[PDB]
Design a protein around this motif. Structure first.
Motif, short mmCIF file in Angstrom:
data_model
loop_
_atom_site.label_atom_id
_atom_site.label_comp_id
_atom_site.label_asym_id
_atom_site.label_seq_id
_atom_site.Cartn_x
_atom_site.Cartn_y
_atom_site.Cartn_z
N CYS A 145 -4.22 24.87 65.33
CA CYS A 145 -2.73 24.88 65.32
C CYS A 145 -2.41 25.06 64.07
O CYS A 145 -1.45 25.34 63.40
CB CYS A 145 -1.81 23.95 65.95
SG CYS A 145 -1.63 24.24 67.70
N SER A 146 -3.38 24.30 62.86
CA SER A 146 -3.07 24.17 61.45
C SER A 146 -3.48 25.47 60.94
O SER A 146 -3.11 25.73 59.75
CB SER A 146 -3.96 23.15 60.95
OG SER A 146 -5.30 23.63 60.73
N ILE A 147 -4.14 26.42 61.34
CA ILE A 147 -4.67 27.92 60.99
C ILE A 147 -3.52 28.77 60.97
O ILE A 147 -2.74 29.04 62.33
CB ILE A 147 -5.80 28.46 61.66
CG1 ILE A 147 -7.02 27.35 61.40
CG2 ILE A 147 -6.05 29.82 61.03
CD1 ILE A 147 -8.17 27.74 62.40
N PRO A 148 -2.90 29.26 60.03
CA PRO A 148 -1.92 30.63 60.04
C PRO A 148 -2.29 31.48 60.84
O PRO A 148 -3.42 32.19 61.04
CB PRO A 148 -1.91 30.92 58.54
CG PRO A 148 -2.27 29.78 57.77
CD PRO A 148 -3.32 29.04 58.71
N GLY A 149 -1.52 32.23 61.86
CA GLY A 149 -1.82 32.97 62.91
C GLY A 149 -2.21 32.60 64.21
O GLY A 149 -2.40 33.32 65.23
N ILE A 150 -2.44 31.25 64.32
CA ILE A 150 -2.69 30.67 65.71
C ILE A 150 -1.51 29.72 65.90
O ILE A 150 -1.33 28.70 65.35
CB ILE A 150 -4.10 29.92 65.51
CG1 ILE A 150 -5.28 30.71 65.32
CG2 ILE A 150 -4.39 29.03 66.79
CD1 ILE A 150 -6.42 30.37 65.07
#
Ligand SMILES: O=c1ccn([C@H]2C[C@H](O)[C@@H](COP(=O)(O)NP(=O)(O)OP(=O)(O)O)O2)c(=O)[nH]1
Ligand SMILES: [K+]
Ligand SMILES: [K+]
Ligand SMILES: [K+]
Ligand SMILES: [Mg+2]
Ligand code: NA
Ligand code: NA
Length: 339
Positions: free
Chosen positions: A64-69
């Motif tokens: 959830c920390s990844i942009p796009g997820i």
DNA sequence: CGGCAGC
DNA sequence: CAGTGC
DNA sequence: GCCG
DNA sequence: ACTG
């Protein structure tokens, strides 16, 4: 960072999350052939984020920390991570492989595939024998298998050289640049993309029709799909070619001819990738600019209601580097734009 | 919730 | 206009 | 699908 | 953007 156009695509060279992205790509493609283009786009961006990430994803929180997820994508990532499978794949409609088959025909998209499916068609022989086909679709169907393959880079080289040599026979000063996946350095190419211009600002004029006629007369062009011969400054040809000699296959070929003043923006567009372009154009818009295959401009002009009413003012860009510089983006070589 | 590139 | 594509 |  |  949130912007793929600000990052090198070589981040994807080692995919630490291959086990996950292979499963997600099946689901993404199902949504795509069903016409759910925005859901499929969200999957494509999540898959690039997983490919780019510097290690295997090991937790829902990290995902959830990844942009796009987001939450929904993280749930699926963790199911795959911990069970080896994605149960949702078991429930994909039986129509999806047929819709994929039909939309693999050049010129048939999701609406045409759905229509054929509703008519009861299930195979390419059903299409050939019974379906109503546009002129473009009949070409796409007759070359179905040739066009589904990616050709070796060595064959793309021979094709772009065929075009270059034929063009430079008319004017030796023309610049002929292979673009698309060829320019990005890929080992295989879905088609060949060629950009032509002339540095004197004028001598590109007339070459388009002379070149197509020459290549047609030699038997190199076999079918035409789209021609934009007379609209504005840029000319575009989408068609079909075949190298001479035994056993050669038909291949898709795209040619664009542009004036020199538009060369940088046309090259940037035609080099892609498509996701890179969409990222860079969205970034330009957030900076009060607008980016197209013609130019980098100031923001489009709008009326009291928000409606676009006219173009922005063109900012001169002699080279690709200048577009990156004016957008405040680190320059990326073509091979690093492979998003 | 609406936008997701610009031709 | 709807569909399709680069 | 995600983002804002 | 063309195609129809
Ligand atoms: O939707 C698109 C598609 C393509 N393009 C640009 C970038 C792409 O690299 C270029 C050529 O289109 P192709 O379909 O030939 N893609 P590419 O050459 O990157 O890959 P392939 O090996 O599949 O042809 O046109 C876009 O800007 N938007
Ligand atoms: K990586
Ligand atoms: K996120
Ligand atoms: K397709
Ligand atoms: Mg290509
Ligand atoms: Na298609
Ligand atoms: Na192409």
């Amino acid at each position: 960072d949130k912007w793929v156009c600000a990052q090198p695509s070589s981040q994807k060279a080692t995919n630490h999350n291959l086990h996950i992205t292979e499963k997600l790509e099946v689901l993404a493609k199902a949504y795509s052939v069903q016409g759910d283009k925005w859901r499929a786009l969200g999957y494509a961006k999540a898959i690039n984020a997983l490919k780019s990430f510097h290690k295997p994803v090991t937790s829902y929180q990290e995902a959830c920390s990844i942009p796009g997820i987001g939450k929904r994508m993280a749930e699926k990532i963790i199911e795959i991570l911990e069970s080896g499978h994605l149960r949702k794949l078991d429930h994909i409609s039986e129509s999806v492989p047929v819709l994929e088959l039909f939309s693999n025909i050049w010129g048939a998209g999701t609406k045409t595939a759905q229509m054929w499916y509703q008519q009861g068609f299930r195979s390419l022989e059903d299409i050939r024998s019974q379906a109503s086909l546009t002129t473009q679709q009949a070409i796409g169907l007759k070359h179905y298998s040739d066009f589904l393959e990616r050709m070796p880079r060595e064959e793309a080289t021979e094709i772009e050289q065929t075009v270059q040599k034929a063009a430079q026979a008319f004017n030796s000063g023309l610049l002929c640049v292979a673009c698309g996946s060829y320019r990005r350095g890929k080992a295989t190419c879905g088609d060949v993309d060629v950009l032509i211009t002339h540095p004197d600002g004028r001598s590109h004029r007339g070459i388009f029709s002379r070149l197509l006629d020459s290549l047609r007369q030699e038997g190199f062009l076999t079918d035409d799909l789209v021609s934009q011969e007379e609209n504005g400054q840029q000319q575009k040809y989408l068609g079909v070619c075949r190298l001479p000699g035994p056993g050669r296959r038909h291949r898709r070929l795209d040619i664009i001819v542009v004036p020199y003043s538009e060369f940088a923006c046309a090259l940037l567009y035609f080099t892609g990738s498509a996701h890179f372009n969409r990222s860079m154009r969205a970034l330009a818009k957030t900076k009060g600019m607008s980016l197209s295959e013609h130019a980098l401009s100031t923001a489009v002009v709008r009326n009291t209601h928000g409606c676009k009413v006219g173009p922005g003012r063109v900012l001169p860009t002699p080279t690709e580097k200048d577009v990156f510089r004016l957008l405040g983006l680190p320059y990326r070589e073509p091979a690093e734009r492979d998003w």
